[PDB]
Design a protein around this ligand. Structure first.
Ligand code: DZ4
Ligand code: MG
Ligand code: MG
Length: 55
DNA sequence: AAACTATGCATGCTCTACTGCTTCTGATCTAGTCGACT
């Protein structure tokens, strides 16, 4: 599709047991970036947000 | 010798603290129902 309403991403790791708590860490890092306007929650394995992309 | 006064004591009353037991109340964890989303 050349258009849409959101960007859907999936995060995975080649190892088995490593994928334990990636999403909270990435979420916190992005929040520290200063791009998240809304967060679903503000252990989890899913979250939809509203990024602030530069324009 | 008799009348008045003095001390002395006891017991019930009141208050304030103190400790320990019992009951009531406020803070903290989950089932169900409705709704949101991918
Ligand atoms: N009710 C549902 N049931 C099963 N899978 C679903 C679903 N709703 C979404 N998915 C799954 C399948 C969907 O492909 C995937 C993406 O969800 P979106 O971002 O909400 N819808 P899309 O990306 O297709 O349209 P756009 O490009 O405009 O955003 O999530
Ligand atoms: Mg989508
Ligand atoms: Mg989506």
């Amino acid at each position: 599709k050349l258009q849409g309403h959101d960007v859907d991403f999936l995060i995975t790791h080649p190892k088995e047991g490593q994928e334990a708590g990636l999403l909270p860490r990435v979420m916190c890092r992005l929040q520290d970036q200063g791009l998240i306007l809304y967060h679903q929650h503000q252990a989890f394995e899913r979250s939809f947000c509203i990024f602030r992309l530069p324009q």
